[PDB]
Amino acid sequence: GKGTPSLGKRHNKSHTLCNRCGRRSFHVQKKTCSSCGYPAAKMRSHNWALKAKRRRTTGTGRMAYLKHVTRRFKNGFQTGVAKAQT
Amino acid sequence: GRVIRNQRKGAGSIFTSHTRLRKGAAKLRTLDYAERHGYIRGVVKQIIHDPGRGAPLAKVAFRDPYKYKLREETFIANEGVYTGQFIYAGKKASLNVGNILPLGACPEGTIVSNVEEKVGDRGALGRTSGNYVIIIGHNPDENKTRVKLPSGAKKIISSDARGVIGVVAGGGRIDKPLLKAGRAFHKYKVKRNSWPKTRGVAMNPVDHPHGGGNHQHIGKASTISRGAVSGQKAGLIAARRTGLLRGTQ
Amino acid sequence: PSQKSFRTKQKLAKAQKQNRPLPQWIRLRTDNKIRYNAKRRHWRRTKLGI
Amino acid sequence: AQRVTYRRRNPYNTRSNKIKVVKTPGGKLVAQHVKKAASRVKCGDCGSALAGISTLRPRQYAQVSKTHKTVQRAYGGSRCANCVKERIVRAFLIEEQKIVKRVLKEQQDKEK
RNA sequence: GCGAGAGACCGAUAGCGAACAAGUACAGUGAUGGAAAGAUGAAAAGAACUUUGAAAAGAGAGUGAAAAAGUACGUGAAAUUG
RNA sequence: AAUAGGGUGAAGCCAGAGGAAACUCUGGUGGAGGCUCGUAGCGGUUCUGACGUGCAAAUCGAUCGUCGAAUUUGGGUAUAGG
RNA sequence: UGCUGUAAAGCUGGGUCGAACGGCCUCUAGUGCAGAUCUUGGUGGUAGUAGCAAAUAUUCAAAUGAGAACUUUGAAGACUGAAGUGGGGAAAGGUUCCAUGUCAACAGCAGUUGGACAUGGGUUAGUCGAUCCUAAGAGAUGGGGAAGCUCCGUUUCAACGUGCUUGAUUUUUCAGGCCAACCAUCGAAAGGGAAUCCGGUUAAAAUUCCGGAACUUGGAUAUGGAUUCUUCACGGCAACGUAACUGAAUGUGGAGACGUCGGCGUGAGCCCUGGGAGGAGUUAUCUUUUCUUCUUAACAGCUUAUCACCCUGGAAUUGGUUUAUCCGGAGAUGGGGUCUUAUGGCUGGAAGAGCGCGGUAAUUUUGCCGCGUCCGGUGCGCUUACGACGGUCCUUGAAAAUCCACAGGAAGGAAUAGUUUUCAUGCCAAGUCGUACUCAUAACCGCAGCAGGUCUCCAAGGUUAACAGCCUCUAGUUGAUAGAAUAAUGUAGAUAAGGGAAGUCGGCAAAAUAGAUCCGUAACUUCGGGAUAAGGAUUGGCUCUAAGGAUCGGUAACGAUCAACUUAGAACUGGUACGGACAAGGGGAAUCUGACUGUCUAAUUAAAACAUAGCAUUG
RNA sequence: UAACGAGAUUCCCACUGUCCCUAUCUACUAUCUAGCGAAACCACAGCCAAGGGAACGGGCUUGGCAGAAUCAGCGGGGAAAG
RNA sequence: AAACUUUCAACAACGGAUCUCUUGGUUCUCGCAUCGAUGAAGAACGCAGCGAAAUGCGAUACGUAAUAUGAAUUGCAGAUAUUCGUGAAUCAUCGAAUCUUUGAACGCACAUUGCGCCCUCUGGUAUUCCGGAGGGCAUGCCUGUUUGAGCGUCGU
Ligand SMILES: CN[C@@H]1[C@@H](O)[C@@H](O[C@@H]2[C@@H](O)[C@H](O[C@H]3O[C@H]([C@@H](C)O)[C@@H](O)[C@H](O)[C@H]3N)[C@@H](N)C[C@H]2N)OC[C@]1(C)O
Ligand SMILES: CN[C@@H]1[C@@H](O)[C@@H](O[C@@H]2[C@@H](O)[C@H](O[C@H]3O[C@H]([C@@H](C)O)[C@@H](O)[C@H](O)[C@H]3N)[C@@H](N)C[C@H]2N)OC[C@]1(C)O
Ligand SMILES: CN[C@@H]1[C@@H](O)[C@@H](O[C@@H]2[C@@H](O)[C@H](O[C@H]3O[C@H]([C@@H](C)O)[C@@H](O)[C@H](O)[C@H]3N)[C@@H](N)C[C@H]2N)OC[C@]1(C)O
Ligand SMILES: [Zn+2]
Ligand SMILES: [Zn+2]
C-alpha cells in the first residue's frame, strides 16, 4: 500500500508562499524558505549550484535603480536642471 | 554499526518526561527567618494524586511573614496527614507526624522523610511511597547527624538540614502484581517512553552489541568495565559480582 | 476551500485574468508573430501550485 | 423524516458544536446550535453550590443586577451559610480562648 | 559590470540551455530539474464572385513572376504509403 | 472525534434453608472482564482464486483475524542521514 | 540520358528549383559511418489485431436538429433503500458555479449534450468564522560559546514600567500616592471564546439581501424611580427575598475547567395512533376506507425541579428507602418552607407568517379575495440532551485569555440636600479578511473523467435481537460503446445415480452445521473454566384460553375507566410443511510449540519470531 | 501445564464431483458486425530426415518433396519474450 | 488468368533531411570604475480606448516635468490634438519628480492585508469612546546634550 493507496493521503502542505521570493518554498513548521533562506538576513546561495544563481540574480528583475547609474555616471552625477538654449 | 537506544535517550527528543498532568514539584519551604529561629504554622488544604508518582502530595497554606499574602506549598504527604491538619515547620516545631524539623532536633531512631542533603535544598532523600530515613545518631560538636537511607546506606548530614516526621504515604504499591501489559502501558503513559523493552539479543549487530548470531546469545561477558565508552555499556555495568544472591549481605 | 486567505484569493484572481485567449486585433499588427496565447491553463490539467 | 445539517462550517461533533432539532413555523425541521451549559457557583470552603445565585456562563454575570449574584449576608456570593456560621463561631471561641491563655499565663509567672 | 572593435570560430540535432512571449512551458513537498520551437511573397495582392454541401471543405473563378509559394506556407531527401 | 445487537454473569446487596456448634447450602439482585458470538471499524489467513502489456507500479472476489481496549482515527507538534 | 576511372569518385542529358557557386596551385581542420542494448527526430510490420465484458436494465412516443441507442419532455420498467447512488461540511482544488452561444480538439462508440470551447454574470455579516487566548512546542532580548555561517539560554548571574490612580490645572505644565512576583512574540477555521431568529427573495448569494422581531459590546447622557434628618434600603426565626439600595489600595474565592463505563429518570425530535375539517385515490365487490394538510423561531414576562439547604420535632417493636443498600442523636421518619431554571406550561413574538382548499381579473409585470388551519391517546420504541446515582485505575483523566463575587474599610458623602448608568426608559456606533461551487465510481491525490486512497454531521415504514440481510416512502440516479448469435477453451455460479478421500505433498476447494425454546453434556482444570463440549427434541397457519398492570372511588380481598406486548397452554388444520427467502458454529481423540490479549517484514514469510505480566542480576 | 492459537502434525465421525468418470445448465467473454484502436517483439526469415559442423540447423550437403488467398483454435518448435 | 505478393518508373503522400541565409552564439583584443538605510538587488500585485504574454511603468502607473528636435502614430478607432509652431511623435536626451505591497527592511506581528503608542489637523453634543488626513516610534556603535546612580570618592 505504499504506492497508489498511500499517494491518496497528500492534502497537508509542507511549504507555502515565501514573502521574500514568492516561490512556495517557505517551510511551514520551520518558518524558513528552502530557496532564499528567509528570514535570514542574507540570501541563500551556493557555489555548487551556479544554475540556481542564474535563476535569481541581478538583472533577472527590473533593476529599477541600477538601470540608470551608468547614465548618471556618464554625466558626472549632475545636480541642477537643463538650461534652455537661447 | 548504529547509535544504540541507550545513546538515543540522552538527546531527549521522545524520551523527555510526560509532565502535562503533574501537580507541581514537591519541595519544602525555603529556609527563612521563621524556620531558622522559631516555627511557622500552615494548614493542609488538599491531599492529591500526582500522576507518575506513587506517593500523594499535600497542598499546604502558609502566611507570608513580610507582606499580606498567602503562600501555597507542595509537600510529599506522610501517612496519617489529613486535610485540615496544622503543620508546624521550624526549629521549635514539635515532634509530630507531618511537622518539618531540623535533624538535630530529632532524637535517635526518629523516622523522617523528604530529607535535605544540604541545608536549604528543600528535600532530596526518602521521597517515594512507603520509604523513610532513620536517624542513627548525633555528633553535636561537629553539628552533624548520621542517618540510614532507604537503600541501606549510612550518611552524615548537617544537623541544620530539615526533614519531615513520618513515613511517605502510599506504601505497598509493589506488593500487588501488575498482571498485564496494559497496566504497565498505563503506568508509563504518564512517566516517560521507556516501555516496552526490546532485548538486545533479539536485534541485529548494527542495533546493539548483543545482536546477531545464528542463535540468540550474548557471546562475550555481559559485565562491562566502568571505563567503557558510550555504545559499549550494555549489560551489567561495573558489576562487582553476578548471579543469584544467597545468604546475607 | 471556501475559507481562504486574502493572499491566496489575490493569487487566484490574477490566474483567472491570465487565462484568456488572444485578442484578435493583435494578429493584425505590423510584423506580429503571436497567433495564440501559449500560456493557457485549465483547472483540471495543470495545477497552480499555490 | 426530515434530516438536518449544521448551520456553521464546523462539521465535527465537538463540545461547542452541539445542535438541537426544532420545528419552525414554516413547518421545517432545522438544527439550532446550543450553547454550553453553565455551572453552579460553588462555596469557597466546602465546594458546594450556593443557593440564590444564578447559574450563568461567566461572561453573562456582567449583564445581570447584583441581587442575582449575591446573598444578603456576610460572604454572600462567596461562602455558603453553614461555612459562614462555622467561621463566626470559630472566630469567637478562639479569641475568647486567647484571653484565657493570656490570663492563665500571667498566673504562671506571678506565683513563680 | 559598463562601453567598443574584431576572428582561417558555429551556422538552427551546430553555436550559450535559450537566434523565437527561455531560465519560458512543464515536473518535484523541497533543494532543484528544465525542453521543443528560425525562412509565404517584392508587396497580403491572405483568394472578390458563382456553384455543390449541414458544415469542414470541393469545383469554377481570381491575385501573383511562381499557388510545382494558400499563413498544414522557401527548397522539400530517405524510411514508409496510395 | 468514533465504536449495532447478543452471550456469560465477578465483587457488593436482599431473602430463605440446614446444623449442637464450627459452619454449610439455596433463590434472587447486581453488572465486572486487555471475557465471548457478531456488525461498522481496524487488519490481512487461504484459495498459492481473478488480474498479471491490470481498473490498479499491490487492485478485485470469496474465505478469514479482531471488534471496549497495549482500540481506531483527523489536525497540531517534536525527532534528519553513520 | 549517357561517358570516364581497377576503385574511392568525377563529368554529362531530362525534370524540379530560386541565389549563389566552382576548376587549378597551396594552407588549415570540429574532414568521410552500418553497427557502439550509440544520440535526437521520424516511420513500419505486428494490425484494423489484442481489445473497448466489475458496480441488476432498459423501452415507446413526441420535440429539436442536416444528422438522435446516447440531448430535452412525456409515459413506463428499475435501482440506491436513511450505515443512501439522499442533504451538508473540514482538508485539497480554484470559477469547475449560472445564463447564453457553440462542437475543431477532449468526453478510448457517438454527440444536437458536457466539469469541453466562447462571451458575460455571480460570492453583501456588529451577531457565522478568522482575528484574540493559551497547548505540546517555536522563538527575540543584557548575555555565554563559536574562525564564522551561527549555537546555547526564555523560572534565562540584567539598573529591563514606551506603569496605574488621583485633586485638578490647562499654564498642554503639575503635584502627590500606589505598586512592578508574572507577562517580547508566535502556536488551534475540531480546544477556550460577547451577541440573531423566523418568513420571503435569485439564473446563480444568503443565520450576510428584503420584511418583521431581538440581542451583545463600547460610549454618551437625559428623564423617572430608588437612596439620605437613624446619612450609604428594607423584609424573613432561618434557608433567603427584592427594581434599585457608596465602597480605593490590597487579598481571596468562583466560573472558564474537563476521563471512562453501567443501568435508572425526565425532556425534545422522530415513529405509532383516535375524532373532526379539507383534498387526492380505488371502486365488478368491499374497505365509518388507501394516501395526504392541520405548523409555530430567536427573544420578553409569569410560572415550573431532581439534588441541596432551612425551621420544627426527638427516634428499638429500629425506621425511611433505590432496578442497583445506603441513610439517621454529627438529628431519621413525620409536618412546613428556601434555592438552582436544566426542562416543560401559559401569554407576548403570532397569524399579519407558513400550509391546505375554493374563486376571480388577465396574451399581463406581480396578483387579489373567501374559508379553515381544531381536540386527544400511547411506549423496556429510535436518536439525542440533561439529571440523580453506581463502578473503575501502581491510569485519577489541559492551559490561558476573560467575567463575576467576596474580605477590607481609603475616600467621599445629609436636610430644604450628595448619589448611581449593577432599577426602567431614552441616544450613538460596531472596522478588516473569508463567504460562488465540488467534497468525489468525473471538480482532491494517484501522469487520466483510474473498480485505489481521503476526516466528519443528519437518518422513515415492514421483518428482526439488530443501525445485519431482504422489500418499500421522501430524495437521487437510470451513468458504465452498441447490435447479432450462443462453437471450443476460459471467468463467475449451479446440480448430479452408486461409492465416500480410493484423489492429492496435504480434504486444497467444496459440502455438511447454523436462529430460538426445552433436554442433556466427558476427560482435564490454575476451580475461574473446558461448554454452544458431545448429542437429542421442538418450531407454520388459524380459532381460543390463562398469567403478568396504571388511575380513580370508604374483609377496597371490591367496582369503574384506561392501557404495552411478553410468556404459557389448548383445539382445529395441511402433499410431515413450518429459523420455509434472508440470516446463520461442523464436531471429537491426541502430539509439537508459544502461557494468555497484543505486535512486525506497506509490495512474496503473521510464525514457534517480537512484546508481555512474573522472575533474577547490575549501577 | 488448564485456557488460548487464520501456528506444525496424526487419527476418527459427519460431509461431500477431490476421485472412480464424467455429464448437463446459467451469465459474461471468446465469436461475427458498426465505431474506436494500442503493445511486446522484429539480422534476414520461416516444411521435414540424415550428415558434417562451435560436438541438438530455417539457411550449408544429400535426400523426401513442393500450388494462390485464408478463418477459428492450439501450445511441439522458433535452444520464443521479459 | 485474377486477387495477393515482389521489383522498377511516374505522379500524389508521409516526414523534415539537403541547400542557401542569420538583429543569435562563441572566442580574442581595446577602453572605463559607477549598487545599497538618500532604502539596493530580488519578490508580489496592479497600470493602456480596445492586451493574454514580452517590453515599460507605479494610483502622477505602456508614464509626469525638463532639454533637444521638428510632423507624425498606425491593427482599428479618436480629440474639446497638432503644422511658417511654445509644436505631432520620440526610454532622442535626461539634471526635476512620482515611485503601490514588500524586501538588508526598521513600532510589534505576518500561513493574518492582525495589533498598538505618540504629535498636528478634522467629523460625530468629546482629555477618555468611534471615524478620517498628514507626520512619527528598529537594532549595534561613535561624538555631543540633558536627566541621573553608586559610603567608588574629594572638599565644604
Ligand atoms: C505551423 N506550425 C508551426 C510553424 O511555425 C512551424 O514552422 C515550420 C517552419 O519552421 C519550417 O521552416 C523551416 O525551414 C528550415 C527548413 C528545414 O525547412 C528549417 O531548418 C527551419 O528550422 C524552419 N524555419 C517550414 N518549412 C514549415 C513550418 N510548418 O514551426 C512551429 C509550428 C508550431 O509547427
Ligand atoms: C563504515 N564506513 C562508512 C563509509 O562506507 C561511508 O558510508 C557511505 C555513506 O556515507 C554514503 O552516504 C553519503 O551519500 C548519501 C547519498 C547522497 O548517496 C547521503 O545521503 C549521505 O548523507 C552521505 N554520507 C552512502 N550512500 C554509502 C555508505 N557506504 O561513509 C563513512 C562511513 C559511515 O564510516
Ligand atoms: C566567581 N564569580 C561568581 C560568578 O561565577 C557567578 O556565580 C554563578 C551564580 O551566579 C549562579 O547562580 C545564579 O544563576 C542561576 C542560574 C544558572 O540558574 C540561578 O538559578 C541562581 O539563582 C543565580 N544565583 C551559579 N549557578 C553558578 C555560579 N558560577 O556570580 C557570582 C560570582 C561570585 O561573581
Ligand atoms: Zn523565499
Ligand atoms: Zn461551604
PDB file of C-alpha atoms (C1' of nucleotides) in Angstrom, chain G residues 44-45 47-53 109 481-484 487-488 490-503 507 511-512 526 530 586-595 597 608, chain H residues 1-42 44 72-75:
ATOM      1  C1'   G G  44       6.987   0.415 -40.398  1.00  0.00           C
ATOM      2  C1'   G G  45       5.414  -4.983 -39.884  1.00  0.00           C
ATOM      3  C1'   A G  47      -2.815  -4.801 -37.202  1.00  0.00           C
ATOM      4  C1'   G G  48      -7.984  -2.915 -38.500  1.00  0.00           C
ATOM      5  C1'   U G  49      -5.070  -7.207 -34.486  1.00  0.00           C
ATOM      6  C1'   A G  50      -5.273  -7.551 -28.523  1.00  0.00           C
ATOM      7  C1'   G G  51      -9.091  -5.349 -27.080  1.00  0.00           C
ATOM      8  C1'   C G  52     -13.337  -1.302 -25.594  1.00  0.00           C
ATOM      9  C1'   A G  53     -17.111  -7.861 -20.632  1.00  0.00           C
ATOM     10  C1'   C G 109     -18.579   4.405 -29.645  1.00  0.00           C
ATOM     11  C1'   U G 481     -19.870   1.766 -26.633  1.00  0.00           C
ATOM     12  C1'   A G 482     -23.663  -0.785 -29.117  1.00  0.00           C
ATOM     13  C1'   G G 483     -26.057  -4.760 -32.423  1.00  0.00           C
ATOM     14  C1'   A G 484     -26.460 -10.181 -33.922  1.00  0.00           C
ATOM     15  C1'   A G 487     -18.641 -23.387 -31.026  1.00  0.00           C
ATOM     16  C1'   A G 488     -14.261 -24.796 -28.234  1.00  0.00           C
ATOM     17  C1'   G G 490     -11.984 -19.858 -20.089  1.00  0.00           C
ATOM     18  C1'   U G 491     -14.032 -16.440 -15.655  1.00  0.00           C
ATOM     19  C1'   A G 492     -18.183 -16.364 -12.074  1.00  0.00           C
ATOM     20  C1'   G G 493     -22.088 -19.527 -10.363  1.00  0.00           C
ATOM     21  C1'   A G 494     -25.166 -24.333 -10.070  1.00  0.00           C
ATOM     22  C1'   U G 495     -26.751 -29.651  -9.951  1.00  0.00           C
ATOM     23  C1'   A G 496     -25.609 -34.838 -10.197  1.00  0.00           C
ATOM     24  C1'   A G 497     -27.017 -42.166  -9.752  1.00  0.00           C
ATOM     25  C1'   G G 498     -23.849 -45.751  -6.635  1.00  0.00           C
ATOM     26  C1'   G G 499     -19.381 -45.251  -3.779  1.00  0.00           C
ATOM     27  C1'   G G 500     -17.393 -41.662   0.024  1.00  0.00           C
ATOM     28  C1'   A G 501     -10.744 -39.055   0.297  1.00  0.00           C
ATOM     29  C1'   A G 502      -9.850 -44.630  -3.275  1.00  0.00           C
ATOM     30  C1'   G G 503      -7.913 -38.097  -5.362  1.00  0.00           C
ATOM     31  C1'   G G 507      -9.502 -32.889   2.331  1.00  0.00           C
ATOM     32  C1'   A G 511     -20.063 -29.862   1.100  1.00  0.00           C
ATOM     33  C1'   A G 512     -22.012 -30.590   5.777  1.00  0.00           C
ATOM     34  C1'   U G 526      -4.747 -22.622  37.771  1.00  0.00           C
ATOM     35  C1'   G G 530     -13.444 -26.627  29.449  1.00  0.00           C
ATOM     36  C1'   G G 586     -19.092 -28.811  11.806  1.00  0.00           C
ATOM     37  C1'   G G 587     -17.517 -31.962  15.814  1.00  0.00           C
ATOM     38  C1'   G G 588     -14.181 -35.491  18.556  1.00  0.00           C
ATOM     39  C1'   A G 589      -9.138 -38.139  20.394  1.00  0.00           C
ATOM     40  C1'   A G 590      -4.080 -36.658  20.557  1.00  0.00           C
ATOM     41  C1'   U G 591       1.307 -34.844  19.630  1.00  0.00           C
ATOM     42  C1'   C G 592       4.888 -30.389  18.772  1.00  0.00           C
ATOM     43  C1'   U G 593       5.128 -25.421  20.065  1.00  0.00           C
ATOM     44  C1'   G G 594       4.285 -20.194  22.149  1.00  0.00           C
ATOM     45  C1'   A G 595       1.136 -19.241  28.531  1.00  0.00           C
ATOM     46  C1'   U G 597      -4.907 -10.342  24.944  1.00  0.00           C
ATOM     47  C1'   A G 608       7.224 -21.288  17.066  1.00  0.00           C
TER      48        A G 608
ATOM     49  C1'   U H   1       0.929 -27.341  32.270  1.00  0.00           C
ATOM     50  C1'   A H   2      -5.710 -25.648  32.474  1.00  0.00           C
ATOM     51  C1'   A H   3      -7.026 -21.837  28.897  1.00  0.00           C
ATOM     52  C1'   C H   4      -5.980 -19.623  24.340  1.00  0.00           C
ATOM     53  C1'   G H   5      -3.965 -20.112  18.500  1.00  0.00           C
ATOM     54  C1'   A H   6      -6.088 -17.784  10.436  1.00  0.00           C
ATOM     55  C1'   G H   7       0.857 -21.825  14.015  1.00  0.00           C
ATOM     56  C1'   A H   8       3.087 -27.540  12.549  1.00  0.00           C
ATOM     57  C1'   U H   9       1.229 -32.796  12.599  1.00  0.00           C
ATOM     58  C1'   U H  10      -1.749 -37.946  13.029  1.00  0.00           C
ATOM     59  C1'   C H  11      -6.326 -40.496  13.511  1.00  0.00           C
ATOM     60  C1'   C H  12     -11.791 -40.577  13.755  1.00  0.00           C
ATOM     61  C1'   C H  13     -17.252 -39.174  12.994  1.00  0.00           C
ATOM     62  C1'   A H  14     -20.142 -36.057   9.633  1.00  0.00           C
ATOM     63  C1'   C H  15     -19.720 -34.383   4.739  1.00  0.00           C
ATOM     64  C1'   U H  16     -19.200 -34.147   0.034  1.00  0.00           C
ATOM     65  C1'   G H  17     -17.654 -34.186  -8.073  1.00  0.00           C
ATOM     66  C1'   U H  18     -11.129 -34.470  -4.620  1.00  0.00           C
ATOM     67  C1'   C H  19     -11.607 -39.029  -7.148  1.00  0.00           C
ATOM     68  C1'   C H  20     -13.937 -43.794  -9.936  1.00  0.00           C
ATOM     69  C1'   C H  21     -15.838 -40.678 -14.600  1.00  0.00           C
ATOM     70  C1'   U H  22     -17.586 -37.722 -16.317  1.00  0.00           C
ATOM     71  C1'   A H  23     -22.367 -35.251 -17.799  1.00  0.00           C
ATOM     72  C1'   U H  24     -25.741 -31.038 -18.001  1.00  0.00           C
ATOM     73  C1'   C H  25     -27.293 -25.790 -17.055  1.00  0.00           C
ATOM     74  C1'   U H  26     -26.816 -20.104 -16.499  1.00  0.00           C
ATOM     75  C1'   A H  27     -24.445 -15.071 -17.006  1.00  0.00           C
ATOM     76  C1'   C H  28     -20.063 -12.598 -19.078  1.00  0.00           C
ATOM     77  C1'   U H  29     -16.279 -13.356 -22.793  1.00  0.00           C
ATOM     78  C1'   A H  30     -14.325 -15.545 -26.785  1.00  0.00           C
ATOM     79  C1'   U H  31     -17.073 -15.326 -31.930  1.00  0.00           C
ATOM     80  C1'   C H  32     -19.343 -12.024 -36.306  1.00  0.00           C
ATOM     81  C1'   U H  33     -20.671  -6.712 -37.190  1.00  0.00           C
ATOM     82  C1'   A H  34     -20.595  -0.639 -36.834  1.00  0.00           C
ATOM     83  C1'   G H  35     -17.405   2.766 -34.479  1.00  0.00           C
ATOM     84  C1'   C H  36     -12.687   3.133 -31.927  1.00  0.00           C
ATOM     85  C1'   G H  37      -7.957   1.146 -31.680  1.00  0.00           C
ATOM     86  C1'   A H  38      -2.737   0.038 -28.713  1.00  0.00           C
ATOM     87  C1'   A H  39       1.871  -3.044 -27.153  1.00  0.00           C
ATOM     88  C1'   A H  40       5.701  -6.842 -26.606  1.00  0.00           C
ATOM     89  C1'   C H  41       8.770  -8.285 -30.249  1.00  0.00           C
ATOM     90  C1'   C H  42      11.429  -7.982 -35.320  1.00  0.00           C
ATOM     91  C1'   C H  44      17.074 -11.970 -42.825  1.00  0.00           C
ATOM     92  C1'   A H  72     -11.229 -20.461 -35.509  1.00  0.00           C
ATOM     93  C1'   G H  73      -8.331 -22.950 -32.086  1.00  0.00           C
ATOM     94  C1'   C H  74      -3.529 -24.815 -30.144  1.00  0.00           C
ATOM     95  C1'   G H  75       0.561 -24.879 -27.027  1.00  0.00           C
TER      96        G H  75
END
